[PDB]
mmCIF file of C-alpha atoms and ligand atoms in Angstrom:
data_model
loop_
_atom_site.group_PDB
_atom_site.id
_atom_site.type_symbol
_atom_site.label_atom_id
_atom_site.label_comp_id
_atom_site.label_asym_id
_atom_site.label_seq_id
_atom_site.Cartn_x
_atom_site.Cartn_y
_atom_site.Cartn_z
ATOM 1 C CA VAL A 1 114.826 108.740 171.043
ATOM 2 C CA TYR A 2 113.013 106.978 173.842
ATOM 3 C CA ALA A 3 115.756 107.782 176.381
ATOM 4 C CA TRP A 4 116.230 111.435 175.401
ATOM 5 C CA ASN A 5 118.759 113.581 177.211
ATOM 6 C CA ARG A 6 118.645 117.115 178.630
ATOM 7 C CA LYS A 7 121.484 119.516 179.137
ATOM 8 C CA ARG A 8 120.988 122.815 180.995
ATOM 9 C CA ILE A 9 122.631 125.891 179.383
ATOM 10 C CA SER A 10 122.720 128.818 181.757
ATOM 11 C CA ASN A 11 124.924 131.707 182.833
ATOM 12 C CA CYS A 12 126.652 132.262 179.545
ATOM 13 C CA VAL A 13 126.624 134.324 176.302
ATOM 14 C CA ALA A 14 124.871 132.798 173.336
ATOM 15 C CA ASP A 15 126.124 132.962 169.726
ATOM 16 C CA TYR A 16 123.646 131.672 167.161
ATOM 17 C CA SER A 17 125.687 132.725 164.100
ATOM 18 C CA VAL A 18 127.909 129.557 164.485
ATOM 19 C CA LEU A 19 124.842 127.354 164.207
ATOM 20 C CA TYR A 20 123.672 129.464 161.224
ATOM 21 C CA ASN A 21 126.899 129.015 159.364
ATOM 22 C CA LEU A 22 128.594 125.711 160.061
ATOM 23 C CA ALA A 23 125.589 123.405 159.838
ATOM 24 C CA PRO A 24 125.238 122.383 156.153
ATOM 25 C CA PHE A 25 121.521 121.815 156.007
ATOM 26 C CA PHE A 26 119.711 122.351 159.278
ATOM 27 C CA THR A 27 116.053 123.099 158.626
ATOM 28 C CA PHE A 28 115.753 125.385 161.641
ATOM 29 C CA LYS A 29 112.034 126.072 161.501
ATOM 30 C CA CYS A 30 111.174 127.747 164.759
ATOM 31 C CA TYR A 31 108.093 128.443 166.841
ATOM 32 C CA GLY A 32 107.069 131.585 168.722
ATOM 33 C CA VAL A 33 110.056 133.664 167.851
ATOM 34 C CA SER A 34 111.788 135.000 164.752
ATOM 35 C CA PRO A 35 115.079 133.226 164.146
ATOM 36 C CA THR A 36 116.897 136.293 162.874
ATOM 37 C CA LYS A 37 116.236 138.130 166.148
ATOM 38 C CA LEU A 38 117.522 135.478 168.583
ATOM 39 C CA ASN A 39 120.658 137.550 169.357
ATOM 40 C CA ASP A 40 119.073 140.525 171.138
ATOM 41 C CA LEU A 41 116.581 138.742 173.454
ATOM 42 C CA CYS A 42 117.230 137.559 177.049
ATOM 43 C CA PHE A 43 116.125 134.134 178.221
ATOM 44 C CA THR A 44 115.114 132.865 181.603
ATOM 45 C CA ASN A 45 116.324 129.250 180.983
ATOM 46 C CA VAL A 46 117.616 127.437 177.848
ATOM 47 C CA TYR A 47 117.339 123.641 177.751
ATOM 48 C CA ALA A 48 118.823 121.276 175.053
ATOM 49 C CA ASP A 49 117.404 117.993 173.789
ATOM 50 C CA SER A 50 119.133 115.405 171.585
ATOM 51 C CA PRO B 1 124.195 103.057 153.708
ATOM 52 C CA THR B 2 122.038 101.439 151.025
ATOM 53 C CA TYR B 3 118.785 102.604 152.633
ATOM 54 C CA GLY B 4 116.729 105.273 151.065
ATOM 55 C CA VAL B 5 116.922 108.884 151.950
ATOM 56 C CA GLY B 6 113.636 108.551 153.828
ATOM 57 C CA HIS B 7 115.015 105.954 156.305
ATOM 58 C CA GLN B 8 118.443 107.540 156.767
ATOM 59 C CA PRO B 9 119.256 108.608 160.303
ATOM 60 C CA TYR B 10 118.886 112.214 161.355
ATOM 61 C CA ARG B 11 120.156 114.043 164.423
ATOM 62 C CA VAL B 12 117.618 116.340 165.985
ATOM 63 C CA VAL B 13 118.344 118.998 168.717
ATOM 64 C CA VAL B 14 115.308 120.870 170.222
ATOM 65 C CA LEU B 15 115.839 124.085 172.104
ATOM 66 C CA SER B 16 113.292 125.365 174.655
ATOM 67 C CA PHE B 17 113.614 128.979 175.638
ATOM 68 C CA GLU B 18 111.648 130.682 178.471
ATOM 69 C CA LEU B 19 110.743 134.219 177.393
ATOM 70 C CA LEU B 20 108.967 135.063 180.591
ATOM 71 C CA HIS B 21 112.201 136.868 181.382
ATOM 72 C CA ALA B 22 111.936 136.751 185.224
ATOM 73 C CA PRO B 23 115.639 136.550 186.197
ATOM 74 C CA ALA B 24 117.149 136.827 182.704
ATOM 75 C CA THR B 25 120.502 134.935 182.647
ATOM 76 C CA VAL B 26 121.321 133.911 179.135
ATOM 77 C CA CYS B 27 121.259 137.344 177.532
ATOM 78 C CA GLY B 28 122.800 137.356 174.062
ATOM 79 C CA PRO B 29 125.695 139.358 172.636
ATOM 80 C CA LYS B 30 125.489 143.202 172.831
ATOM 81 C CA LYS B 31 127.007 146.169 174.679
ATOM 82 C CA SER B 32 125.885 148.348 177.577
ATOM 83 C CA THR B 33 125.919 152.141 177.686
ATOM 84 C CA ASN B 34 125.654 154.247 180.859
ATOM 85 C CA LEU B 35 122.356 155.174 182.724
ATOM 86 C CA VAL B 36 120.956 158.782 182.773
ATOM 87 C CA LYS B 37 118.127 159.963 184.959
ATOM 88 C CA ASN B 38 115.422 162.634 184.629
ATOM 89 C CA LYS B 39 115.655 162.671 180.922
ATOM 90 C CA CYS B 40 113.181 161.232 178.301
ATOM 91 C CA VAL B 41 115.431 158.673 176.586
ATOM 92 C CA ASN B 42 115.251 155.350 174.737
ATOM 93 C CA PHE B 43 115.929 152.612 177.315
ATOM 94 C CA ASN B 44 116.547 148.939 176.504
ATOM 95 C CA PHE B 45 116.514 147.239 179.918
ATOM 96 C CA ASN B 46 116.880 143.440 179.361
ATOM 97 C CA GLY B 47 115.663 143.569 175.822
ATOM 98 C CA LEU B 48 112.606 145.653 176.461
ATOM 99 C CA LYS B 49 111.981 148.596 174.228
ATOM 100 C CA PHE C 1 124.567 136.450 138.971
ATOM 101 C CA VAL C 2 126.192 133.241 140.173
ATOM 102 C CA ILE C 3 126.549 132.066 143.812
ATOM 103 C CA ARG C 4 127.212 128.768 145.728
ATOM 104 C CA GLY C 5 124.490 126.382 146.886
ATOM 105 C CA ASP C 6 124.718 127.229 150.555
ATOM 106 C CA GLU C 7 123.855 131.003 150.350
ATOM 107 C CA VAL C 8 120.931 130.621 147.928
ATOM 108 C CA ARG C 9 118.808 131.574 150.982
ATOM 109 C CA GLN C 10 120.754 134.857 151.392
ATOM 110 C CA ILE C 11 119.184 136.184 148.209
ATOM 111 C CA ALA C 12 115.765 136.920 149.714
ATOM 112 C CA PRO C 13 114.079 139.683 151.651
ATOM 113 C CA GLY C 14 114.698 139.730 155.440
ATOM 114 C CA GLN C 15 117.673 137.366 155.651
ATOM 115 C CA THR C 16 121.278 138.281 156.439
ATOM 116 C CA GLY C 17 124.663 136.980 155.413
ATOM 117 C CA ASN C 18 127.913 137.895 153.772
ATOM 118 C CA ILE C 19 126.455 137.709 150.258
ATOM 119 C CA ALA C 20 123.153 139.324 151.364
ATOM 120 C CA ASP C 21 124.827 142.060 153.328
ATOM 121 C CA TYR C 22 127.639 142.856 150.892
ATOM 122 C CA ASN C 23 127.192 141.366 147.328
ATOM 123 C CA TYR C 24 123.522 141.580 146.556
ATOM 124 C CA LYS C 25 120.807 142.992 148.811
ATOM 125 C CA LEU C 26 117.011 142.901 148.088
ATOM 126 C CA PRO C 27 114.630 145.704 149.269
ATOM 127 C CA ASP C 28 112.097 145.212 151.997
ATOM 128 C CA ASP C 29 109.275 145.951 149.566
ATOM 129 C CA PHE C 30 109.855 143.530 146.644
ATOM 130 C CA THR C 31 107.699 142.581 143.764
ATOM 131 C CA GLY C 32 109.378 139.852 141.654
ATOM 132 C CA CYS C 33 110.510 136.304 141.204
ATOM 133 C CA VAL C 34 113.820 134.638 141.697
ATOM 134 C CA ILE C 35 115.013 131.732 139.476
ATOM 135 C CA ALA C 36 118.027 129.566 140.463
ATOM 136 C CA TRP C 37 119.467 126.358 138.970
ATOM 137 C CA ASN C 38 122.522 124.109 139.387
ATOM 138 C CA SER C 39 125.463 124.932 137.137
ATOM 139 C CA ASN C 40 127.862 122.229 138.144
ATOM 140 C CA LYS C 41 127.936 120.760 134.653
ATOM 141 C CA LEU C 42 128.635 124.142 133.105
ATOM 142 C CA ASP C 43 130.760 126.388 135.229
ATOM 143 C CA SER C 44 132.945 123.838 137.176
ATOM 144 C CA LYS C 45 136.597 123.259 136.359
ATOM 145 C CA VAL C 46 138.722 120.231 137.433
ATOM 146 C CA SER C 47 141.525 122.687 138.374
ATOM 147 C CA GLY C 48 139.056 125.293 139.625
ATOM 148 C CA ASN C 49 137.069 128.303 138.417
ATOM 149 C CA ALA D 1 68.763 162.366 199.304
ATOM 150 C CA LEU D 2 71.170 163.747 196.632
ATOM 151 C CA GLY D 3 71.669 160.459 194.879
ATOM 152 C CA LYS D 4 70.690 161.719 191.390
ATOM 153 C CA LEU D 5 73.805 163.997 191.316
ATOM 154 C CA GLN D 6 76.067 161.220 192.638
ATOM 155 C CA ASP D 7 75.042 158.575 190.058
ATOM 156 C CA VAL D 8 76.226 160.742 187.154
ATOM 157 C CA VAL D 9 79.778 161.074 188.696
ATOM 158 C CA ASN D 10 79.844 157.369 189.605
ATOM 159 C CA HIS D 11 78.779 156.329 186.048
ATOM 160 C CA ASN D 12 81.382 158.573 184.401
ATOM 161 C CA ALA D 13 84.205 157.521 186.688
ATOM 162 C CA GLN D 14 83.329 153.821 186.444
ATOM 163 C CA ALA D 15 83.194 154.014 182.636
ATOM 164 C CA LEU D 16 86.515 155.683 182.441
ATOM 165 C CA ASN D 17 87.981 153.027 184.757
ATOM 166 C CA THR D 18 86.726 150.150 182.679
ATOM 167 C CA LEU D 19 88.034 151.826 179.561
ATOM 168 C CA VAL D 20 91.475 152.065 181.158
ATOM 169 C CA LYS D 21 91.295 148.446 182.341
ATOM 170 C CA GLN D 22 90.324 147.155 178.945
ATOM 171 C CA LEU D 23 93.943 147.536 177.816
ATOM 172 C CA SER D 24 94.832 144.341 179.621
ATOM 173 C CA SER D 25 93.098 142.013 177.108
ATOM 174 C CA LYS D 26 95.395 140.223 174.739
ATOM 175 C CA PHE D 27 92.647 140.006 172.132
ATOM 176 C CA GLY D 28 94.120 136.594 170.942
ATOM 177 C CA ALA D 29 97.562 137.834 170.227
ATOM 178 C CA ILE D 30 100.770 136.631 171.858
ATOM 179 C CA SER D 31 101.130 139.598 174.245
ATOM 180 C CA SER D 32 99.293 142.797 175.139
ATOM 181 C CA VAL D 33 102.537 144.871 175.061
ATOM 182 C CA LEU D 34 103.654 146.461 171.772
ATOM 183 C CA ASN D 35 107.381 146.637 172.140
ATOM 184 C CA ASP D 36 107.989 142.924 172.969
ATOM 185 C CA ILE D 37 105.682 141.786 170.156
ATOM 186 C CA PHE D 38 107.730 143.866 167.682
ATOM 187 C CA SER D 39 111.056 142.690 169.199
ATOM 188 C CA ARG D 40 110.051 139.075 169.682
ATOM 189 C CA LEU D 41 108.549 138.347 166.224
ATOM 190 C CA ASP D 42 109.256 138.502 162.428
ATOM 191 C CA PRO D 43 107.477 141.457 160.717
ATOM 192 C CA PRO D 44 105.181 139.369 158.383
ATOM 193 C CA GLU D 45 103.260 138.059 161.377
ATOM 194 C CA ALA D 46 103.756 141.253 163.349
ATOM 195 C CA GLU D 47 101.302 142.924 160.831
ATOM 196 C CA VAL D 48 98.390 140.617 161.695
ATOM 197 C CA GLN D 49 99.248 140.520 165.455
HETATM 198 C C1 LIG E 101 131.438 121.482 165.596
HETATM 199 O O1 LIG E 101 132.203 121.377 164.415
HETATM 200 C C2 LIG E 101 133.582 121.849 164.382
HETATM 201 C C3 LIG E 101 134.463 120.859 165.156
HETATM 202 O O2 LIG E 101 134.887 119.791 164.404
HETATM 203 C C4 LIG E 101 133.663 123.211 164.835
HETATM 204 O O3 LIG E 101 133.250 124.124 163.838
HETATM 205 C C5 LIG E 101 134.412 124.802 163.292
HETATM 206 O O4 LIG E 101 134.499 126.144 163.558
HETATM 207 C C6 LIG E 101 135.615 126.829 163.110
HETATM 208 C C7 LIG E 101 135.514 128.256 163.563
HETATM 209 O O5 LIG E 101 136.264 129.129 162.724
HETATM 210 C C8 LIG E 101 135.647 126.735 161.539
HETATM 211 O O6 LIG E 101 136.803 127.384 161.023
HETATM 212 C C9 LIG E 101 135.561 125.295 161.104
HETATM 213 O O7 LIG E 101 135.498 125.248 159.696
HETATM 214 C C10 LIG E 101 134.419 124.598 161.742
HETATM 215 N N1 LIG E 101 134.432 123.183 161.326
HETATM 216 C C11 LIG E 101 133.365 122.554 160.962
HETATM 217 C C12 LIG E 101 133.477 121.100 160.619
HETATM 218 O O8 LIG E 101 132.185 123.078 160.852
HETATM 219 C C13 LIG E 101 132.888 123.572 166.128
HETATM 220 O O9 LIG E 101 133.606 122.995 167.262
HETATM 221 C C14 LIG E 101 131.443 122.983 166.091
HETATM 222 N N2 LIG E 101 130.613 123.787 165.249
HETATM 223 C C15 LIG E 101 129.263 123.827 165.483
HETATM 224 C C16 LIG E 101 128.463 124.771 164.477
HETATM 225 O O10 LIG E 101 128.692 123.160 166.308
#
């Protein structure tokens, strides 16, 4: 947690249905955007933390 | 394994979008029709109604 | 009706999924309550139901 | 010396200009543009926004 990592996701086509389905219990409370409408939108940059 | 559910490890992944949509590069799945000019139509350029 | 544990969310206004889309769909304007409970002791077979 | 006739036109034009310019205020919402705020958000909060 103290040394947290960043991976840059760019120049690709997203698919959030896989995350919807295959994760058993995954909370997924989101801020500033409706989760069910994440497929249509376009994003400047998507970064991943872990 | 004998620890309580409260102290069990959890994997957390945090996504950070940038919806200022200046270049737009990570557009999601969809399908693109043609372009028609000089006609009042419904356009959807880069997710903009 | 009876469903599995994972798709209990799909029975709710505004959410999508195979059960929500195809088996049971709630209206946008809904006035009511939903009750659900585990039925593992009651509807589960060793061979399979 | 015909300032009295000019002030009326100036006042009317300036008032119309400020009325047009007032559309830029976000009024505390996420965005001042309607189409994005419908597309970018879940309807229950869209109502108050
Ligand atoms: C991570 O989990 C597995 C890799 O082990 C993959 O998910 C599989 O996706 C296929 C696609 O049809 C399914 O048939 C499998 O049932 C899935 N397996 C599991 C364990 O979920 C995939 O590589 C990754 N999935 C996600 C959501 O990250």
